[PDB]
Structures are given as structure tokens and as C-alpha cells.
């Protein structure tokens, strides 16, 4: 049992970097996403103008 | 491993196949007390006669 639980134990730690690069990456996207959003606010602007 | 499809799929077979090692491992280990009790009688049949 301690060789497939310290199995288990080293894939849950892995799990942990994986799930925290995710984070990371949808941050990207949020970023990435509230510049375009402020761009077509602006472009929403420009049609009210 | 290098695609995904591969990557999950190696779980799978360095699941069903690490715990061949620890079969063994295991065999083994109960094969060393079997030396062990062994030895408890053997000693034992020598005192004796």
C-alpha cells in the first residue's frame, strides 16, 4: 500500500503545479481578453461618436 | 509520451504494469520471512539432534 499510495501522494503534487500553470494560462487569457475588451468599448465609443 | 492521447493512456499502462513490480516485491518479502521461519526451525531440528 505505500508504494502505490507514494505513487498516488507524487501525482497529487504534480497535480498541484499542473492546476497552477492552469490558473496562470486563463490569467493570460483574462489579460489578453481585457485589453480587447477595453479596445471594443472603445470601438463602441467611436460608433456613439 | 509526447501527445496526450499518450499521455493518459501511459497512466494507464504504467498503472496496471508498476504494480507487477510490487506483485513481486511483495512475493519476495513473504519469500524472506519464509527464509526466516525457516531458519527458526532449522536452528532448532540442529539443537535437537
Same mark, same amino acid.
Given at each position: 500500500? $505505500?508504494?502505490?499510495? $507514494?505513487?498516488?501522494? $507524487? ?12 490558473? $496562470? #494560462? ?21 460608433? #456613439?461618436? | 509520451?509526447?501527445? =496526450?492521447?499518450? =499521455? ?10 508498476? =504494480? =507487477? ?29
Amino acid at each position: 500500500i $505505500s508504494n502505490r499510495l $507514494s505513487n498516488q501522494i $507524487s501525482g497529487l503534487n504534480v497535480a498541484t503545479r499542473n492546476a497552477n500553470d492552469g490558473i $496562470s #494560462l486563463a490569467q493570460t487569457a483574462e489579460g489578453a481578453l481585457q485589453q480587447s475588451t477595453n479596445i471594443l468599448q472603445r470601438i463602441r465609443d467611436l460608433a #456613439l461618436q | 509520451i509526447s501527445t =496526450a492521447d499518450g =499521455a493518459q493512456n501511459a497512466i494507464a499502462v504504467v498503472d496496471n504494469a508498476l =504494480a =507487477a513490480i510490487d506483485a513481486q516485491r511483495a512475493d519476495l518479502g513473504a519469500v524472506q520471512n519464509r527464509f526466516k521461519n525457516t531458519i527458526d526451525n532449522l536452528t532448532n531440528i540442529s539443537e535437537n539432534a
